[PDB]
Structure 1
Amino acid sequence: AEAGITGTWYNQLGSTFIVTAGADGALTGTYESAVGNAESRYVLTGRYDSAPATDGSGTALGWTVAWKNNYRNAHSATTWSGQYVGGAEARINTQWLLTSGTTEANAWKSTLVGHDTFTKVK
């Protein structure tokens, strides 16, 4: 539901996610991280299922943030993959991959994996 996803959300680390869900399945917005080599807001883009199943199944979605803005550049990018569950306590449960640019010899250790849960603010 675009109106379900659209809004301001926060995760367990204190980071902010502001997103707008479009009728064509597009997601656009900004992300502010509470941790890492990051400062201020960064641009995010993604996609979601705009015609989900009418049962109690979640809405699949995903988005990306490249950690470069006009103030800092960490030479890394993160992608979040998960689903939106709406209702009184709507949540977006995700798993993420954070890849840093490295030399070919240090590539084996270029990707971190984790999970974040977002709660929507009214």
Structure 2
Amino acid sequence: AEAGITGTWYNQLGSTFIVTAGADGALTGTYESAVGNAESRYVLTGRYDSAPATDGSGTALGWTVAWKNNYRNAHSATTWSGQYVGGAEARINTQWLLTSGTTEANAWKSTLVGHDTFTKV
């Protein structure tokens, strides 16, 4: 559970994200996706509950990745919102929103939604 968010995680797509969880709620690290107009690592920043409940619940967290790095700019940003659950097999279950910058004309179709499950395997 605590600390354990820190590590390298992988999702079903093969994306990899390396995060560091700070004692007070911050999440910092890099994200490398396996799909989209992405190329290399991208910086990610987020927050998590540094004092989750002492009952059998997960730890709420979220993070953002703007898809711009020294190699590509896909003019989009993704936010993942979910919870971490530890145990012999820890995982982070998330739902995400990917918004692309559009002209007002196409704002209605600017956001994709999906889900990703991350494990340390």
TM-score of the aligned structures, taking structure 2 as reference length: 0.98
Q: How far does residue 118 in structure 1 lie from its aligned partner after superposition?
A: 0.2
Partner of residue 47, structure 1:
47
Q: Distance in 1 between matches of 2:52 and 2:23?
A: 13
Is the contact made by 1:38 and 1:72 (CA closer than 8 Å) also made in structure 2?
A: yes
Q: Distance in 2 between matches of 1:21 and 1:120?
A: 15
Name the SS of the counterpart of 2:28 in structure 1. Answer: strand
Q: Distance in 2 between matches of 1:28 and 1:66?
A: 13
Deviation track 1:16-42 (CA, whole Å, cap 9, x = no partner) reads 010000011100000000000010000
Deviation track 1:4-58 (CA, whole Å, cap 9, x = no partner) reads 1000000000000100000111000000000000100000000000001111100
Q: How far does residue 2 in structure 1 lie from its aligned partner after superposition?
A: 4.2
Q: How far does residue 120 in structure 1 lie from its aligned partner after superposition?
A: 1.5
- Number of residue pairs matched by the alignment: 121
Partner of residue 2, structure 1:
2
Name the SS of the counterpart of 2:3 in structure 1. Answer: helix
Matches within 5 A, 1:1-122: 1-121=1-121
TM-score of the aligned structures, taking structure 1 as reference length: 0.97
Q: Distance in 2 between matches of 1:56 and 1:50?
A: 15
Gaps (5+ residues) in structure 1? none
Gaps (5+ residues) in structure 2? none
Deviation track 1:67-99 (CA, whole Å, cap 9, x = no partner) reads 000011000000000000000010000000000
Is the contact made by 1:11 and 1:117 (CA closer than 8 Å) also made in structure 2?
A: yes
Name the SS of the counterpart of 1:84 in structure 2. Answer: strand
Is the contact made by 1:98 and 1:111 (CA closer than 8 Å) also made in structure 2?
A: yes
Identity %: 100
Name the SS of the counterpart of 1:57 in structure 2. Answer: coil
* Shift >3 Å, 4+ stretches: none
